[PDB]
């Protein structure tokens, strides 16, 4: 058996009033008759609008980032503000932030923990680069990332947690990830959770696949024992997302 | 004579639905009978709401930050998105971003230039740290910042530009800035614009003061020859802002 799946749309830095409206209408009209949690992560700018027009009950909205505390951080957005706005989902430590915005294992760790403390559901991202993969350090590295996070969490916290595996080594590297490789990375994280936190925590823990997923590969990927879902980029701005949600049956 | 003044509210990482609503109502009810441009920079989260409820015609809204292009920058916000949302003002290269978020003279420069190209009005921030001030490098440093920006601009671009002087050396340093010192920094920037771009550009160019301004010091500060306004922090979340706008007559 699997825990409930998650199909998450990571819109990243994209979207227009018009496009998003249209995209959101498609969703509201879609039939989803299964155990599935659909998540929509739009930009800070569009939360308001998403919040309002997204009415299909199998969907929640989420932020793409946040900082922990409110204050003198011009440009930034705090958890406190989100929660007041009414946002309960959030994506933290995505590869792009890790790469461009100076997010270390510890900054991430810290954010997650705040998020968890304020009662958010967290999609926490981890994954290794090509250098790391090529030298055979996948295990070494992801476990290091997961550990940094778990270090700050209590057993009960895990229930609010979702891990997303990002095969960075295969992202813009001209390198291609296969389902089996996905499965192998996921089986690692799960093994770690099991042996370190509890087979109880491990078995309800959702692990999302966050490499390239489209309407074509989605099925084969979800068919894997340890994949519970997806954190989707590109495809999630197209109607093809709908196909991916269905891939989760 | 002076160019039209600007009273800008930099809300930074603060605010709640309720607070901001109340704060915004005060504004809508205020009498402003003079040449003044009031600017309100709320978080990405609250733009929507500000946009909607702020109805006093002497007010515009602005963003606190942005990146240049849309794309795969999870967490971030592009100019393209703002413009579509209907935002035409923006604060760029604030001391806090320079300090915590890795913004160099060139990143700033680049952002400004994009912003300008897309038709935004830009409040561009510059200022030196205590080390810099103490060693006598104020002139050296600010001119370096302004230059990095001007490097990318055409003469016509200046019309969309607003410079804000941030006396960082005096921000959380237990060091205190006086009006005369403000005036001296502003006179420098102006001298530079004059001699390098044109006395024409210099004389219409608005230079905002962006250190600590409250309802008490506001007057003495604006009375200075080269101060055209303010980029306000703390006080701008209180009703005292209204007092500062009036300080601009």
GROMACS .gro file of N, CA and C in nm, chain B residues 157-236:
model
  240
  406UNK      N    1   1.668   5.766  -1.971
  406UNK     CA    2   1.627   5.680  -1.861
  406UNK      C    3   1.614   5.742  -1.724
  407UNK      N    4   1.699   5.841  -1.701
  407UNK     CA    5   1.701   5.911  -1.573
  407UNK      C    6   1.566   5.965  -1.532
  408UNK      N    7   1.484   5.991  -1.629
  408UNK     CA    8   1.356   6.049  -1.592
  408UNK      C    9   1.272   5.953  -1.513
  409UNK      N   10   1.307   5.824  -1.524
  409UNK     CA   11   1.229   5.720  -1.451
  409UNK      C   12   1.304   5.682  -1.324
  410UNK      N   13   1.404   5.762  -1.287
  410UNK     CA   14   1.480   5.720  -1.183
  410UNK      C   15   1.471   5.809  -1.061
  411UNK      N   16   1.477   5.743  -0.946
  411UNK     CA   17   1.480   5.805  -0.814
  411UNK      C   18   1.590   5.738  -0.734
  412UNK      N   19   1.677   5.818  -0.674
  412UNK     CA   20   1.785   5.767  -0.595
  412UNK      C   21   1.750   5.786  -0.452
  413UNK      N   22   1.782   5.683  -0.371
  413UNK     CA   23   1.759   5.696  -0.228
  413UNK      C   24   1.887   5.676  -0.153
  414UNK      N   25   1.921   5.770  -0.065
  414UNK     CA   26   2.044   5.763   0.009
  414UNK      C   27   2.025   5.691   0.140
  415UNK      N   28   2.096   5.583   0.157
  415UNK     CA   29   2.086   5.507   0.278
  415UNK      C   30   2.215   5.518   0.351
  416UNK      N   31   2.210   5.585   0.462
  416UNK     CA   32   2.323   5.598   0.549
  416UNK      C   33   2.332   5.470   0.634
  417UNK      N   34   2.389   5.365   0.574
  417UNK     CA   35   2.397   5.239   0.640
  417UNK      C   36   2.487   5.247   0.764
  418UNK      N   37   2.589   5.331   0.756
  418UNK     CA   38   2.684   5.347   0.866
  418UNK      C   39   2.611   5.385   0.993
  419UNK      N   40   2.492   5.433   0.975
  419UNK     CA   41   2.418   5.481   1.088
  419UNK      C   42   2.294   5.394   1.120
  420UNK      N   43   2.295   5.269   1.074
  420UNK     CA   44   2.178   5.185   1.084
  420UNK      C   45   2.207   5.060   1.166
  421UNK      N   46   2.168   5.069   1.293
  421UNK     CA   47   2.196   4.960   1.381
  421UNK      C   48   2.340   4.961   1.425
  422UNK      N   49   2.401   5.078   1.422
  422UNK     CA   50   2.540   5.088   1.456
  422UNK      C   51   2.555   5.173   1.580
  423UNK      N   52   2.440   5.221   1.624
  423UNK     CA   53   2.449   5.303   1.743
  423UNK      C   54   2.511   5.437   1.707
  424UNK      N   55   2.527   5.453   1.576
  424UNK     CA   56   2.575   5.579   1.523
  424UNK      C   57   2.456   5.663   1.479
  425UNK      N   58   2.459   5.791   1.500
  425UNK     CA   59   2.347   5.874   1.461
  425UNK      C   60   2.371   5.978   1.351
  426UNK      N   61   2.284   5.977   1.245
  426UNK     CA   62   2.300   6.073   1.137
  426UNK      C   63   2.223   6.200   1.159
  427UNK      N   64   2.286   6.311   1.127
  427UNK     CA   65   2.225   6.441   1.138
  427UNK      C   66   2.190   6.492   1.004
  428UNK      N   67   2.093   6.580   0.999
  428UNK     CA   68   2.050   6.649   0.879
  428UNK      C   69   2.163   6.704   0.790
  429UNK      N   70   2.258   6.772   0.851
  429UNK     CA   71   2.366   6.820   0.776
  429UNK      C   72   2.439   6.708   0.707
  430UNK      N   73   2.459   6.596   0.778
  430UNK     CA   74   2.531   6.485   0.710
  430UNK      C   75   2.449   6.432   0.593
  431UNK      N   76   2.318   6.416   0.616
  431UNK     CA   77   2.230   6.381   0.505
  431UNK      C   78   2.245   6.471   0.382
  432UNK      N   79   2.231   6.601   0.406
  432UNK     CA   80   2.250   6.703   0.305
  432UNK      C   81   2.380   6.691   0.231
  433UNK      N   82   2.483   6.655   0.307
  433UNK     CA   83   2.618   6.641   0.246
  433UNK      C   84   2.624   6.521   0.157
  434UNK      N   85   2.560   6.413   0.199
  434UNK     CA   86   2.563   6.301   0.108
  434UNK      C   87   2.479   6.333  -0.010
  435UNK      N   88   2.369   6.402   0.010
  435UNK     CA   89   2.288   6.421  -0.109
  435UNK      C   90   2.357   6.516  -0.208
  436UNK      N   91   2.414   6.622  -0.156
  436UNK     CA   92   2.486   6.715  -0.243
  436UNK      C   93   2.593   6.648  -0.329
  437UNK      N   94   2.650   6.536  -0.279
  437UNK     CA   95   2.751   6.459  -0.354
  437UNK      C   96   2.688   6.391  -0.476
  438UNK      N   97   2.574   6.326  -0.452
  438UNK     CA   98   2.517   6.251  -0.557
  438UNK      C   99   2.476   6.350  -0.662
  439UNK      N  100   2.422   6.462  -0.616
  439UNK     CA  101   2.373   6.556  -0.714
  439UNK      C  102   2.483   6.612  -0.796
  440UNK      N  103   2.592   6.646  -0.731
  440UNK     CA  104   2.713   6.696  -0.801
  440UNK      C  105   2.764   6.603  -0.906
  441UNK      N  106   2.765   6.473  -0.873
  441UNK     CA  107   2.798   6.372  -0.968
  441UNK      C  108   2.704   6.366  -1.089
  442UNK      N  109   2.575   6.369  -1.064
  442UNK     CA  110   2.481   6.364  -1.174
  442UNK      C  111   2.500   6.485  -1.263
  443UNK      N  112   2.519   6.599  -1.201
  443UNK     CA  113   2.533   6.722  -1.273
  443UNK      C  114   2.649   6.718  -1.369
  444UNK      N  115   2.765   6.697  -1.311
  444UNK     CA  116   2.889   6.696  -1.382
  444UNK      C  117   2.901   6.579  -1.476
  445UNK      N  118   2.837   6.467  -1.451
  445UNK     CA  119   2.849   6.352  -1.542
  445UNK      C  120   2.734   6.332  -1.636
  446UNK      N  121   2.611   6.370  -1.600
  446UNK     CA  122   2.504   6.341  -1.691
  446UNK      C  123   2.448   6.469  -1.749
  447UNK      N  124   2.449   6.573  -1.669
  447UNK     CA  125   2.390   6.698  -1.716
  447UNK      C  126   2.317   6.770  -1.602
  448UNK      N  127   2.340   6.900  -1.594
  448UNK     CA  128   2.274   6.985  -1.497
  448UNK      C  129   2.124   6.982  -1.515
  449UNK      N  130   2.084   6.934  -1.636
  449UNK     CA  131   1.943   6.922  -1.665
  449UNK      C  132   1.888   6.801  -1.588
  450UNK      N  133   1.947   6.687  -1.610
  450UNK     CA  134   1.913   6.565  -1.536
  450UNK      C  135   1.923   6.588  -1.384
  451UNK      N  136   2.037   6.644  -1.336
  451UNK     CA  137   2.060   6.672  -1.195
  451UNK      C  138   1.947   6.748  -1.125
  452UNK      N  139   1.903   6.856  -1.185
  452UNK     CA  140   1.802   6.941  -1.127
  452UNK      C  141   1.661   6.882  -1.122
  453UNK      N  142   1.626   6.785  -1.209
  453UNK     CA  143   1.495   6.724  -1.189
  453UNK      C  144   1.499   6.593  -1.105
  454UNK      N  145   1.623   6.538  -1.088
  454UNK     CA  146   1.650   6.413  -1.018
  454UNK      C  147   1.610   6.414  -0.871
  455UNK      N  148   1.524   6.320  -0.833
  455UNK     CA  149   1.483   6.320  -0.692
  455UNK      C  150   1.577   6.235  -0.611
  456UNK      N  151   1.627   6.295  -0.506
  456UNK     CA  152   1.708   6.218  -0.412
  456UNK      C  153   1.635   6.207  -0.277
  457UNK      N  154   1.598   6.081  -0.248
  457UNK     CA  155   1.537   6.051  -0.120
  457UNK      C  156   1.633   6.014  -0.005
  458UNK      N  157   1.598   6.059   0.112
  458UNK     CA  158   1.666   6.023   0.231
  458UNK      C  159   1.605   5.892   0.286
  459UNK      N  160   1.690   5.794   0.312
  459UNK     CA  161   1.641   5.665   0.355
  459UNK      C  162   1.702   5.614   0.489
  460UNK      N  163   1.750   5.702   0.576
  460UNK     CA  164   1.787   5.661   0.708
  460UNK      C  165   1.664   5.669   0.790
  461UNK      N  166   1.679   5.683   0.921
  461UNK     CA  167   1.566   5.691   1.019
  461UNK      C  168   1.485   5.818   1.011
  462UNK      N  169   1.360   5.806   0.972
  462UNK     CA  170   1.283   5.930   0.971
  462UNK      C  171   1.155   5.908   1.042
  463UNK      N  172   1.123   5.994   1.133
  463UNK     CA  173   1.000   5.985   1.203
  463UNK      C  174   0.926   6.115   1.186
  464UNK      N  175   0.816   6.131   1.263
  464UNK     CA  176   0.731   6.255   1.247
  464UNK      C  177   0.802   6.375   1.304
  465UNK      N  178   0.893   6.350   1.399
  465UNK     CA  179   0.964   6.462   1.463
  465UNK      C  180   1.077   6.522   1.379
  466UNK      N  181   1.168   6.435   1.331
  466UNK     CA  182   1.280   6.485   1.249
  466UNK      C  183   1.248   6.515   1.104
  467UNK      N  184   1.132   6.466   1.055
  467UNK     CA  185   1.103   6.480   0.914
  467UNK      C  186   1.123   6.622   0.854
  468UNK      N  187   1.075   6.722   0.922
  468UNK     CA  188   1.081   6.859   0.874
  468UNK      C  189   1.221   6.906   0.854
  469UNK      N  190   1.297   6.906   0.960
  469UNK     CA  191   1.437   6.952   0.952
  469UNK      C  192   1.510   6.882   0.839
  470UNK      N  193   1.487   6.754   0.821
  470UNK     CA  194   1.547   6.685   0.713
  470UNK      C  195   1.506   6.734   0.575
  471UNK      N  196   1.378   6.754   0.555
  471UNK     CA  197   1.331   6.792   0.417
  471UNK      C  198   1.372   6.933   0.383
  472UNK      N  199   1.382   7.018   0.486
  472UNK     CA  200   1.429   7.155   0.472
  472UNK      C  201   1.566   7.168   0.399
  473UNK      N  202   1.640   7.061   0.394
  473UNK     CA  203   1.766   7.065   0.330
  473UNK      C  204   1.750   7.076   0.177
  474UNK      N  205   1.837   7.156   0.121
  474UNK     CA  206   1.843   7.188  -0.015
  474UNK      C  207   1.837   7.068  -0.101
  475UNK      N  208   1.918   6.967  -0.072
  475UNK     CA  209   1.916   6.853  -0.163
  475UNK      C  210   1.832   6.732  -0.127
  476UNK      N  211   1.753   6.740  -0.020
  476UNK     CA  212   1.663   6.631   0.012
  476UNK      C  213   1.528   6.651  -0.055
  477UNK      N  214   1.483   6.551  -0.130
  477UNK     CA  215   1.353   6.559  -0.193
  477UNK      C  216   1.251   6.460  -0.139
  478UNK      N  217   1.258   6.421  -0.015
  478UNK     CA  218   1.167   6.310   0.014
  478UNK      C  219   1.228   6.202   0.103
  479UNK      N  220   1.160   6.093   0.120
  479UNK     CA  221   1.205   5.989   0.210
  479UNK      C  222   1.167   5.851   0.170
  480UNK      N  223   1.254   5.756   0.202
  480UNK     CA  224   1.221   5.615   0.189
  480UNK      C  225   1.209   5.562   0.331
  481UNK      N  226   1.085   5.546   0.377
  481UNK     CA  227   1.068   5.518   0.521
  481UNK      C  228   1.040   5.372   0.553
  482UNK      N  229   1.105   5.331   0.662
  482UNK     CA  230   1.095   5.197   0.728
  482UNK      C  231   0.986   5.198   0.835
  483UNK      N  232   1.029   5.175   0.956
  483UNK     CA  233   0.943   5.160   1.076
  483UNK      C  234   0.819   5.249   1.084
  484UNK      N  235   0.839   5.380   1.097
  484UNK     CA  236   0.735   5.478   1.100
  484UNK      C  237   0.628   5.459   0.994
  485UNK      N  238   0.661   5.392   0.886
  485UNK     CA  239   0.568   5.379   0.776
  485UNK      C  240   0.463   5.272   0.798
   0.00000   0.00000   0.00000
